Amino acid sequence: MEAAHSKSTEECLAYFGVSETTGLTPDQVKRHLEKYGHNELPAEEGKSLWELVIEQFEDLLVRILLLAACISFVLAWFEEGEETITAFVEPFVILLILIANAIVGVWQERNAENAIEALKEYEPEMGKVYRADRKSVQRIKARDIVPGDIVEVAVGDKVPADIRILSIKSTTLRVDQSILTGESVSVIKHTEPVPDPRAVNQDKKNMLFSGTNIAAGKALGIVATTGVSTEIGKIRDQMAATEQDKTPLQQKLDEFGEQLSKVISLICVAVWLINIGHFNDPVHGGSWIRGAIYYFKIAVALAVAAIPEGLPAVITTCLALGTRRMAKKNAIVRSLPSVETLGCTSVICSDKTGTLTTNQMSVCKMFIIDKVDGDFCSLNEFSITGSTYAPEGEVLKNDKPIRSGQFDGLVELATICALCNDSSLDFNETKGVYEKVGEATETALTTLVEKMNVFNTEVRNLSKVERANACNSVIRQLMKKEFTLEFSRDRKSMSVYCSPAKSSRAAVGNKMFVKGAPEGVIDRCNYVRVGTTRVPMTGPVKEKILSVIKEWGTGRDTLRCLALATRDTPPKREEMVLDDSSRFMEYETDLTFVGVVGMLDPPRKEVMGSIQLCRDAGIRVIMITGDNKGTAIAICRRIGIFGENEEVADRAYTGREFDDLPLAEQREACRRACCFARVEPSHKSKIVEYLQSYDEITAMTGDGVNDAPALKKAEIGIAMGSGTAVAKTASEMVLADDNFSTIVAAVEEGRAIYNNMKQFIRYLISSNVGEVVCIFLTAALGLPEALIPVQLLWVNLVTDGLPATALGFNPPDLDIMDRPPRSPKEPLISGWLFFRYMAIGGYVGAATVGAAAWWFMYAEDGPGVTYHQLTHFMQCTEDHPHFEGLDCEIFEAPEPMTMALSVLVTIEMCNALNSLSENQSLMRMPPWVNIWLLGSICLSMSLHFLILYVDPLPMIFKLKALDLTQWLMVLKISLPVIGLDEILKFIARNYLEG
Ligand SMILES: C/C=C(\C)C(=O)O[C@H]1C(C)=C2[C@H]([C@@H]1OC(=O)CCCCCCC)[C@@](C)(OC(C)=O)C[C@H](OC(=O)CCC)[C@@]1(O)[C@H]2OC(=O)[C@@]1(C)O
Ligand code: ALF
Ligand SMILES: [Mg+2]
């Protein structure tokens, strides 16, 4: 029964047809269970050991490489016996890496916890229902509960289902709805309808929600909805499925691979319309099976030259290193691809409670009565330092530390805060911090008493355990708490009946201590306390009191104000009915106003500066909280999201106000407003979605269960170290430091990493560009196989795989955080940069094929085969009366292939120096700055010698150890690749933009 909150208790019972006293008949339970199902949250486990492997062979850059891998296995069988020394080497390596990289993508994806499983921890095992089966309450499985069931909940119990409250047995029902609102403050419930059908969870005060727990009291109700039809079920539903998309860099890679799949097929066709003028004369040298060998061996060698293999290993290497760095920075990363993204962040959606604030209620302002003289009334206002529950702070009178014992009004004020209090303070010796025991708004009073110390008790010598309730203990030694009249909705206050320590059972020195809402309490005050004296409550006095209440309860302050009063002449204990709470307000009449305490959940000390750093980095921060709009806007002004005098009429909406807006204006409000309050879990994820509709990478940070739907939907989910398990599992990153400043440092790392990532991406891609131009020449110009795909797999993975990672340690810019966020749709290769790598690509491709022809044309230790008689590389064994030369094995010699590969390696080592910077000369930008790059080139050149020395290495690669003769020509062809790119750099920074 949806919208049961808008209906009466009678209408809800009539909806399911069930008596409140008897409950559902066993037949009704049968029919309802078949209709609504079991009260369960369906578990999810899509990530298996099998499906993850299947996912690996789905990528476009993999299927092409896999397709070429299959072919390679076929074209390796067709081989003679003169060169069978290398039988199946190519099909092995091409499949080895395809598994070596696919086994990595699984190891960094299956290791993830289940947010839903953590969410189901809020599902109670059992539940108490009232069936027609028997009069006594049955304790059944919480899953066997059906809509319409009569359910009883008690204090400490975890709510089993979404319930429309029928009757409250206790005086009040206090409920902790932190999983839906993010606020652990006890919510007072009732059994009256909530007319608004569009009401949010914070408005449904007649509803009990599954997962939430009864903080205090006992009540009966009827089940509205079960399973995923519940509010916690909504949270569950928004955390399933492909929840997360692809990294903006991976989108660029997929864009590259998409065009690559179309151009590779284009080149293979291109080398077909040119090879026509030759079929006019046949040749009994080879049929279709022998004439197609050169057409498919170049089709698979083209993909190897194009696809930048080894890059997933380089990226993974670069990401793993950054994670270790940020872990020292106190940021724990759960998702590697999110590191990259974090940098491109433009908007940061932040939770308020627990994230921006300390989640510890603190009395920051309080005032008593100074002087009352006729129509004049002055107040002694005080301010308190400290943002936690620790007894560590100072009472300030106009920014001056003054003891509270000197003020008699503060003495009795602290007395009420200690006596009229069901909560207490405790020091967790394990965590080493002070924790609360009971209501947070009450522990704030306990902490206040300790801070004040109105009796000047020597507490600097006491331990942290004793310090917790030291000053509070002393106050208990003066007045003995007889009984307490608990809180009630009609009264909006609470009181305690106290008696002087050690006295007769017939004296008359008892007192009462009232605490509650300013409106109700002060109205029941007929007197005013000045220190220890008492004066009657008058007009000007009451106005002066209420004025400061309104100034503290609203505006820049906006604090939860509590009126504190005492009844100096309490009624006789014999004439007071304690079993009836309706008479408690009468007992709290003719009061004496003492003072008012103002409390708040204060922001963390380092938040304001952190947000400013984000603004300087061009990153806006939007608060999305389940708390009220009053405190939300107030905090925003404190931490600098809003100006102290800035108008925010259209820059701050509630979830209710946000839903009233047309869908067009909702989307615009996300770009305008920076504060959203009193929201549901679905609202947070909806705001994130709207921001993502503007092509914006958005970060979400929180600590509660209600944050999880937005933590997942956002690009970067950020959790707090002291946050919930549900929040951590749904986040990509966790702040072990619990500081917002950690996020800023992490973004700085994210930006710095990407710039280095952006470098070797360009470097490896440009490397693969030149390789394709090389293959394009040999297939078109007529030259034999200059480079085989077996060699290229060792170049792009080892030869170029090391300087690539070495470019991951490039020195970041000093203005890395003084520059606005980069565009998500920013191409890595465009403009003049595209012309550079195209010229380099055409250079590298010509430097390899050309060097291969150097062994034939401009040679010295090789044959003098001219350009004309080299095109017919095939017609040498079948054609001699027309073509007379030397040998036929010269075309497949291990010297022109080694000559071309040596050039390729040398250029890349030089191109890596040109990849250290984009538009800066090597003179102004010293290549010896990157120490890790120098040691990488030397290591790369060391393996280039190793593969030419140790005999089992140049065998499978078909290479010959080039002497110091042909090696000198390399420094005349490969070396001047610096100047080519240098000129392009000079023009780019002089005729475009420096
Ligand atoms: C690496 C191998 C190269 C040869 C390749 O095929 O990639 C092309 C192609 C897919 C693009 C091109 C390549 O185009 C060519 O270089 C022409 C090739 C055809 C001539 C045959 C040789 C004689 C990139 C590589 O070339 C530059 C270097 O000039 C740049 C860029 O790529 C990026 O920005 C990388 C994004 C991760 C892309 O234009 C990209 O397509 C677009 O979607 C982008 C935005 O991706
Ligand atoms: F802690 Al919140 F919205 F402020 F979940
Ligand atoms: Mg929170």
Output the 3-class SS for 499-513.
EECCCCCCCCCCEEE
The annotated binding site for Ca(2+) is made up of 304-305, 307, 309, 768, 771, 796, 799-800, 908
**Distance from residue 339's CA to the centre of ligand 3 (Å):** 23
- 3-state SS assignment for residue 875: coil
Q: Does the active-site annotation cover 351?
A: yes
Ligand nearest to the CA of 355: 3
**Distance from residue 751's CA to the centre of ligand 3 (Å):** 27
- 3-state SS assignment for residue 628: coil
Q: Which of 241, 961, 348, 222 is nearest to 701 (CA)?
A: 348
The annotated binding site is made up of 304-305, 307, 309, 351, 353, 442, 489, 515, 560, 625-627, 678, 684, 703, 706, 768, 771, 796, 799-800, 908
Location of structure tokens 């905090």: 635
For 821, the token pair is 């966020």
Atom of ligand 2 lying closest to residue 706 CA = 5
Alpha-carbon gap, residue 957 to 944, rounded angstroms = 12
For 951, the token pair is 């005999």
Residue 575: CB partners within 8 Å, gap ≥ 6? none
**Any ligand 2 atom below 6 A from CB of 352:** yes
Those residues whose beta carbon sits under 5 angstroms from the ion ligand 3 are 182, 351, 353-354, 703-704
Residue ranges and CATH numbers for the domains of the chain are 12-54+113-240 (2.70.150.10), 55-112+241-345+746-994 (1.20.1110.10), 346-358+603-745 (3.40.50.1000), 359-602 (3.40.1110.10)
**Distance from residue 214's CA to the centre of ligand 2 (Å):** 19
Atom of ligand 2 lying closest to residue 705 CA = 5
Burial 720-743 (b: 16+ CB within 10 A, else e): bbebbebbbbbbbbbbbbbbbbbb
Kindly list the distances between the CA atom of residue 740 and the CA atoms of 182, 186, 691, 701, in Å, as whole numbers in the listed order. 18, 27, 21, 9
Helix ranges restricted to H, 17-78: 26-36, 51-56, 60-74
Q: In the 3-class helix/strand/coil scheme, how is 388-457 assigned residue by residue?
A: CCCCCCCEECCCCECCHHHCHHHHHHHHHHHHCCCCEEEEECCCCEEEEECCHHHHHHHHHHHHHCCCCC
Residue 505: CB partners within 8 Å, gap ≥ 6? none
Three-point CA angle 933, 937, 938, nearest 5° = 115
**Span between the terminal Cα atoms of the chain, in Å:** 67
Contact between residue 39 and residue 93 where contact means Cβ atoms under 8 Å apart: no
Atom of ligand 2 lying closest to residue 624 CA = 3
Atom of ligand 2 lying closest to residue 359 CA = 1
Alpha-carbon gap, residue 987 to 984, rounded angstroms = 5
Probe ligand 2: pick from 180, 352, 679, 701, max atoms within 8 Å of CB?
A: 352
What stretch of H or E contains 540?
Answer: helix 539-553
> What distance separates the 2 farthest-apart alpha carbons in the chain?
139
Probe ligand 1: pick from 65, 256, 981, max atoms within 8 Å of CB?
A: 256
**Distance from residue 626's CA to the centre of ligand 2 (Å):** 5
Q: What are phi and psi of 231, to 5 degrees?
A: -65, -40
Q: Residue 265 gets which letter from DSSP?
A: H
**Distance from residue 413's CA to the centre of ligand 3 (Å):** 31
Atom of ligand 1 lying closest to residue 761 CA = 37
Atom of ligand 2 lying closest to residue 354 CA = 1
Residue at 730: amino acid letter = A
For 811, the token pair is 């020195």
Task: Give, using CA atoms, the residue closest to atom 5 of ligand 2.
Answer: 182
Alpha-carbon gap, residue 673 to 587, rounded angstroms = 48
Q: How many CB atoms lie within 10 A of CB 909?
A: 21
Alpha-carbon gap, residue 12 to 19, rounded angstroms = 11
Alpha-carbon gap, residue 771 to 847, rounded angstroms = 10
Q: Which of 121, 183, 207 is nearest to 158 (CA)?
A: 121
For 107, the token pair is 């190891």
Ligand nearest to the CA of 829: 1
Task: Give, using CA atoms, the residue closest to atom 8 of ligand 1.
Answer: 260
Residue at 965: amino acid letter = T
Q: Residue 627 gets which letter from DSSP?
A: S
Contact between residue 887 and residue 856 where contact means Cβ atoms under 8 Å apart: no
Contact between residue 160 and residue 151 where contact means Cβ atoms under 8 Å apart: yes
- 3-state SS assignment for residue 720: strand
Q: Which of 899, 816, 814 is nearest to 856 (CA)?
A: 899
For 338, the token pair is 């999110």
Per the entry, the structure determination technique was X-ray
Alpha-carbon gap, residue 755 to 826, rounded angstroms = 13
Task: Give, using CA atoms, the residue closest to atom 3 of ligand 2.
Answer: 625
**Distance from residue 181's CA to the centre of ligand 2 (Å):** 6
Pocket (CB within 6 angstroms of ligand 1) = 252-253, 255-256, 259-260, 263, 267, 306, 761, 765-766, 768-769, 772-773, 776, 827-829, 834, 837-838, 841
Q: What are phi and psi of 162, to 5 degrees?
A: -70, 115
Task: Give, using CA atoms, the residue closest to atom 38 of ligand 1.
Answer: 256
Ligand nearest to the CA of 182: 2
**Distance from residue 970's CA to the centre of ligand 1 (Å):** 27
Ligand nearest to the CA of 710: 2
Q: Residue 842 gets which letter from DSSP?
A: H
Ligand nearest to the CA of 311: 1
Strands of 647-705, DSSP E: 652-654, 675-677, 698-702
The annotated binding site for Mg(2+) is made up of 351, 353, 703
Residues in the chain: 994
Contact between residue 163 and residue 145 where contact means Cβ atoms under 8 Å apart: no
For 606, the token pair is 């380092």
Task: Give, using CA atoms, the residue closest to atom 30 of ligand 1.
Answer: 829
**Distance from residue 306's CA to the centre of ligand 1 (Å):** 9
Alpha-carbon gap, residue 824 to 79, rounded angstroms = 50
Atom of ligand 1 lying closest to residue 306 CA = 2
Catalytic pick among 351, 557, 738, 981: 351
Contact between residue 436 and residue 443 where contact means Cβ atoms under 8 Å apart: yes
Alpha-carbon gap, residue 117 to 212, rounded angstroms = 16
